[PDB]
A paper describes a structure:
Somatostatin (SST), an inhibitory hormone that distributes widely in both human central nervous system and periphery tissues negatively regulates multiple hormone releases (growth hormone, glucagon, insulin, gastrin and cholecystokinin) and cell proliferation through SST receptors (SSTRs). There are five types of SSTRs, namely SSTR1–SSTR5, which are divided into two subfamilies: SRIF1 (SSTR2, SSTR3, SSTR5) and SRIF2 (SSTR1, SSTR4) based on phylogenetic, sequence homology and ligand binding profiles. Here, we report five structures of SSTR2 and SSTR4 in different states, including two crystal structures of SSTR2 in complex with a selective peptide antagonist and a non-peptide agonist, respectively, a cryo-electron microscopy (cryo-EM) structure of Gi1-bound SSTR2 in the presence of the endogenous ligand SST-14, as well as two cryo-EM structures of Gi1-bound SSTR4 in complex with SST-14 and a small-molecule agonist J-2156, respectively. The overall structures of SSTR2 and SSTR4 possess the canonical seven-transmembrane (7-TM) architecture with an extended helix VIII in parallel with the membrane.
Numbering used by the authors:
A (entry chain L): 1 to 14
B (entry chain C): 28 to 61
C (entry chain B): 27 to 340
D (entry chain R): 39 to 323
E (entry chain A): 5 to 55, 182 to 354
The structure:
C-alpha cells in the first residue's frame, strides 16, 4: 500500500 | 526557299502527325505501362 | 516576309498538359547530368558524379545494369539504337563505350576514345559501328567502335561546343556551340552546309525536329529559337518574363508539338512550339534539371536533376 | 482551489497544441522537404515521433489533473501509462544517442565515417526502442487503481508487499538510467566536442574558432539548461516525496503539476530546437 | 507476386546494395580540387602524396584517403565545367609568391599576381563553391625571399607601402588573398607557407581537412 502523495506523475489521496 | 513555305510545311507535318501521348493523351491508364 | 507565329492563329492553343510523376526513380547518390532513350522506349541510361553508369527500365522501376566508371566526373551518356553498346563522356576526355549483351554477367569495357583535347560535352550514336562525339575543343569527331580511331573531324565552330543532335535518317545533324551559332554538318560530306547566328548567348541544349527540315536551339539567356534547314531563317522564338535562368535541356515530342525545355529554376516547361506559349509547367525537383529526354514513340518523358532523382512524366 | 486547477488545465492544453503543431511541422519538413538518407535527419524524425506520441498521451494526464475522479477505466489507463512511459525513455535515450553521434562525429571524424551509417542508425533506434520497453517492465506489471473514501479514484502504479522498499527502489532505478546516466553521457559528449573544436581551431591557425566555438558553447549551454530546469526539480521532488512523508498541500500539487508541464515543454522544445536553429533544416524549410 | 521476374528483382536489390556501399565508401574518403594560374608550382604537392584533361592522385595518410584532382590541362573555359566539382571536401589554390614581377604571356600587360587574383576572385564569387572552403598554398618560399631581397614590391601593388622584408610582405599578401572573397562566413581561407618539407605539408593538409569535415558535421547536426 503506502498511499504515496506523489510518486511518478499522479495525485493519489489517502 | 520562302520562310512562309517552311512554316506551312511545319504546320502541315504537325497536324498530320498528331498520334502522340503528351498532346492529347487518348490512351487510358491501363494501356500505358506507367 | 511571313512569320510562323502570325499564321498559327487558325489552330487553337493547346491547354494545360497534366503530366504527373508516374514512376519515381531513386538509388542515385550524385547529381545526374545527361541521359538517353533507347529505340524500345523502355531502357534508359543515366550518369552521375559517383562514377556509376546505371541503366534500367522505367516500367518495373528496378535496376538492370550498373557499370563502375573509371572517371567519376562524367558529364554525358548515350544509348545505342540497337541496345548493345553504351557510351559515356567523362572529364578525362575518354568516351568509354561498354558492351551490355556479353557472354559473362559482368560488363566489359568495349572501347575507349581518348583522341579529343577538350572535355566531352555530349555524344550520340549513329549505329553499332559509327558514333559522333562532341567535345569542348571547338570541334566534333565521328569515331568508329570497330576501328577505335578518329575517322572524321568537323572544325567550323569558333566557340566551345556543348550540344549535338541527330536526325532520323542519320544524314543531317546540327550542332550548337558557345558562340551563339548553330551549324549543320553531314556525316559523309564532311563540311558545314548551313549556319545560323540568331542567338546571342551561350547555347547549351539542342534538339532535332522529327520532320527533318527544322530544329530548335536553347541558349542561356532564357529563350529558345526555332530554325529551319530550308529557308535558313529564324522561324519563331520562345521567351517569357518569368524565365530568367539558362536552358540546359531542350527536347521535342513524338512529332514536335510540345517543345520540351529544361531551365535552372527547379522545374521544366512545355511550349506549344507554334504560338510561343508555355503550355505546361512540371515541378517537383529540388535542384535544377540537367537532362530532359523524350522517348521515340512519345510514350513518356524522363527528367533528371541534380538531386539524384529521376522522374518519369506521362 | 478551483482557479488553480483551471489555470493548470490551461497550461496543460496550450503546451499540448503547441506540441501537436510543432512536432507535425518538423515531421512535414523531414518527410517532404528534407531527405531520409541523412543520419541526423532520421534521428530528429524518430525524436519527433516520440514527441508526437508523448503529446498524444498528455490530454489523458491533463484530464487527470483537472478533476480528481478518473472515469476512463483500468485498461485504458494501463496503455496510456505505458505510452507516456515508453515515450519518456525513448526521448531521453534519443538525446543520449544523438549526443554520442555528435561526439563521435566531432572528436573522431575519421572513425565516424565507418562507425555510424543509415543501416547502423536504424539498428541504434531499434535498440533504443528495445531498451525502452525493458525499463518499463514494472510500470506495465504494477499498474492499477486506487479508490478513495470520498468516491474518487486515482490510477497509479501500485507495489505489492511492504511499503518503503519498492517505492524507493524504483525511484532510484529511474533516476540513474533516466536522469543520472543520460545527463553525464550528454555532458561528457558535449565537453569532448568543445575540446575537439578548440583543438582543431588552434591547430589549423585559421583564427576563426572564436565565433564557431562561441556558437557551439551557447548551443550546449541552452541545451543543458533546459534539460536541468525541466528534469532536475521534477526528480528531486519525487525522491523527497518517497523518502519522507509530506503533508498534502495545494501549493505542492501546483508545483508538482508545474514541473510536469516543464518536462512536456522540454520534450516540446527539443525537436524544434534541433530543427529551427539548424542550418540544413532551415534551408530546406 | 512477380514470380516470372524474381531473379531480375533480386539482382536489382543486390546491385543496389553495392551502390549504397560504394556511395558510403565515397563519403568516407576525401576529394580535393587544386587550381593554379597556369604556372604556379603545383608539382610540389605531388611529392607529398604517397600514391587526359584531368588526372587523379590518390593516397592514404593517417587512416584517411585523399583524392587530388588537377584540372589545369583543361584548355576550355572554366565556366562550363566548374559546377562539376560540387560537394568536394576541400579546394586548393596553388600560387607561387615569387611570381609577382614576371608578366604573363597573354598581352604583355597582365601581371601573374593580377591573373592569379582574378582567377581566385572568379572561383570565389560563384554559386557553385558557396559552401566549400579554399586551402591555398604559397609555393616557392625560399625563391620569394631571394627575389624580395632586391625588389621593392611596389611594381605589383601600387598602394602597398612597408618595409622590404619577408615577415611583413608574406603576411600582407596573405591578408590580401583572404579578404578577396565575399562569403567570409560560409567559406574559410587557409593560408599555408610551403617549405622544403613533405611531412609538414601532408600534416597541414590532414589537419585542414579534419577542420573542414568537422565544421561540415556541425552544419549538418546544427551546432554551427
Amino acid at each position: 500500500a503506502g498511499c504515496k502523495n506523489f510518486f511518478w506523475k499522479t495525485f493519489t489521496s489517502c | 526557299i520562302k520562310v512562309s513555305k517552311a512554316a506551312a510545311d511545319l504546320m502541315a507535318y504537325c497536324e498530320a502527325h498528331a498520334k502522340e501521348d503528351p498532346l492529347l493523351t487518348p490512351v487510358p491508364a491501363s494501356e500505358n505501362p506507367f | 516576309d511571313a512569320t510562323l507565329s502570325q499564321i498559327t492563329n487558325n489552330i487553337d492553343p493547346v491547354g494545360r498538359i497534366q503530366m504527373r510523376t508516374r514512376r519515381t526513380l531513386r538509388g542515385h547518390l550524385a547529381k545526374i547530368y545527361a541521359m538517353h532513350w533507347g529505340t524500345d522506349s523502355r531502357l534508359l541510361v543515366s550518369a552521375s558524379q559517383d562514377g556509376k553508369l546505371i541503366i534500367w527500365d522505367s516500367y518495373t522501376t528496378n535496376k538492370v545494369h550498373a557499370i563502375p566508371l573509371r572517371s567519376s566526373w562524367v558529364m554525358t551518356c548515350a544509348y545505342a539504337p540497337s541496345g548493345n553498346y553504351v557510351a559515356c563522356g567523362g572529364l578525362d576526355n575518354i568516351c568509354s563505350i561498354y558492351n551490355l549483351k556479353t557472354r559473362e554477367g559482368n560488363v566489359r569495357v568495349s572501347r575507349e576514345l581518348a583522341g579529343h583535347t577538350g572535355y566531352l560535352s555530349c555524344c550520340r550514336f549513329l549505329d553499332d559501328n559509327q558514333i559522333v562525339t562532341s567535345s569542348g575543343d571547338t570541334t566534333c569527331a565521328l569515331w568508329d567502335i570497330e576501328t577505335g580511331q578518329q575517322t572524321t573531324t568537323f572544325t567550323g565552330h569558333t566557340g566551345d561546343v556543348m550540344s549535338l543532335s541527330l536526325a532520323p535518317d542519320t544524314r543531317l545533324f546540327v550542332s550548337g556551340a558557345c558562340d551563339a551559332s548553330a551549324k549543320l554538318w553531314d556525316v559523309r560530306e564532311g563540311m558545314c552546309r548551313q549556319t545560323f547566328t540568331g542567338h546571342e548567348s551561350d547555347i547549351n541544349a539542342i534538339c532535332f525536329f522529327p520532320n527533318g527540315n527544322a530544329f530548335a536551339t536553347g541558349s542561356d539567356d532564357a529563350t529558345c529559337r526555332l530554325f529551319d534547314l530550308r529557308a535558313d531563317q529564324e522561324l519563331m522564338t520562345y521567351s517569357h518574363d518569368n524565365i530568367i535562368c539558362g536552358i540546359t535541356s531542350v527536347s521535342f515530342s513524338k512529332s514536335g508539338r510540345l517543345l520540351l525545355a529544361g531551365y535552372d529554376d527547379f522545374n521544366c516547361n512545355v511550349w506549344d512550339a507554334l504560338k510561343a506559349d508555355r503550355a505546361g509547367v512540371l515541378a517537383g525537383h529540388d535542384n535544377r534539371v540537367s537532362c530532359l529526354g523524350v522517348t521515340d514513340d512519345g510514350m513518356a518523358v524522363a527528367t533528371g536533376s541534380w538531386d539524384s532523382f529521376l522522374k518519369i512524366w506521362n | 482551489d478551483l482557479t488553480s486547477n483551471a489555470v493548470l488545465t490551461f497550461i496543460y492544453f496550450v503546451v499540448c497544441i503547441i506540441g501537436l503543431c510543432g512536432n507535425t511541422l518538423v515531421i512535414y519538413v523531414i518527410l517532404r522537404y528534407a531527405k531520409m538518407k541523412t543520419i541526423t535527419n532520421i534521428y530528429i524524425l524518430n525524436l519527433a515521433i516520440a514527441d508526437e506520441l508523448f503529446m498524444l498521451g498528455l490530454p489523458f494526464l491533463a484530464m487527470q489533473v483537472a478533476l480528481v475522479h478518473w472515469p476512463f477505466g483500468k485498461a485504458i489507463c494501463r496503455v496510456v501509462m505505458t505510452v507516456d512511459g515508453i515515450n519518456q525513455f525513448t526521448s531521453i535515450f534519443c538525446l543520449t544517442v544523438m549526443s554520442i553521434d555528435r561526439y563521435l562525429a566531432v572528436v573522431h571524424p575519421i572513425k565516424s565515417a565507418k562507425w555510424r551509417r543509415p543501416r547502423t542508425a536504424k539498428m541504434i533506434t531499434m535498440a533504443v526502442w528495445g531498451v525502452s520497453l525493458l525499463v518499463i517492465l514494472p510500470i506495465m506489471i504494477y499498474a492499477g487503481l486506487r479508490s478513495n473514501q470520498w468516491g474518487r479514484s486515482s490510477c497509479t502504479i501500485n507495489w505489492p508487499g511492504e511499503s518503503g522498499a519498492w517505492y524507493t527502489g524504483f525511484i532510484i532505478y529511474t533516476f540513474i538510467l533516466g536522469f543520472l546516466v543520460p545527463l553525464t553521457i550528454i555532458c561528457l559528449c558535449y565537453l569532448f566536442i568543445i575540446i575537439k573544436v578548440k583543438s582543431s581551431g588552434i591547430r589549423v591557425g585559421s583564427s576563426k574558432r572564436k565565433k564557431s566555438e562561441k556558437k557551439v558553447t551557447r548551443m550546449v549551454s541552452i541545451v543543458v539548461a533546459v534539460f536541468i530546469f525541466c528534469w532536475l526539480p521534477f526528480y528531486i521532488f519525487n525522491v523527497s516525496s518517497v523518502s519522507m512523508a509530506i503533508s498534502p498541500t495545494p501549493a505542492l500539487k501546483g508545483m508538482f503539476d508545474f514541473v510536469v508541464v516543464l518536462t512536456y515543454a522540454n520534450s516540446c522544445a527539443n525537436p524544434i530546437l534541433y530543427a529551427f536553429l539548424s542550418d540544413n533544416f532551415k534551408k530546406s524549410f | 507476386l512477380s514470380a516470372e521476374d524474381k531473379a531480375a528483382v533480386e539482382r536489382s536489390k543486390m546491385i543496389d546494395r553495392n551502390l549504397r556501399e560504394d556511395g558510403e565508401k565515397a563519403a568516407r574518403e576525401v576529394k580535393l580540387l587544386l587550381l593554379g594560374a597556369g604556372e604556379s608550382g603545383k608539382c610540389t604537392i605531388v611529392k607529398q602524396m604517397k600514391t587526359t584533361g584531368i588526372v587523379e592522385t590518390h593516397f592514404t595518410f593517417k587512416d584517411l584517403h585523399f583524392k587530388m584532382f588537377d584540372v589545369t590541362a583543361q584548355r576550355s573555359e572554366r565556366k562550363k565545367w566548374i559546377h562539376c566539382f560540387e560537394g568536394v571536401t576541400a579546394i586548393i589554390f596553388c600560387v607561387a609568391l615569387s611570381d609577382y614581377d614576371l608578366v604573363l604571356a597573354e598581352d604583355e600587360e597582365m601581371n601573374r599576381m593580377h591573373a592569379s587574383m582574378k582567377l581566385f576572385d572568379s572561383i570565389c564569387n560563384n554559386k557553385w563553391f558557396t559552401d566549400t572552403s579554399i586551402i591555398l598554398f604559397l609555393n616557392k618560399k625560399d625563391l620569394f625571399e631571394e627575389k624580395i631581397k632586391k625588389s621593392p614590391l611596389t611594381i605589383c601593388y601600387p598602394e602597398y607601402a612597408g618595409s622590404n622584408t619577408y615577415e611583413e610582405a608574406a603576411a600582407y599578401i596573405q591578408c590580401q588573398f583572404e579578404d578577396l572573397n565575399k562569403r567570409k562566413d560560409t567559406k574559410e581561407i587557409y593560408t599555408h607557407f610551403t617549405c622544403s618539407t613533405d611531412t609538414k605539408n601532408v600534416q597541414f593538409v590532414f589537419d585542414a581537412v579534419t577542420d573542414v569535415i568537422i565544421k561540415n558535421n556541425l552544419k549538418d547536426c546544427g551546432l554551427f
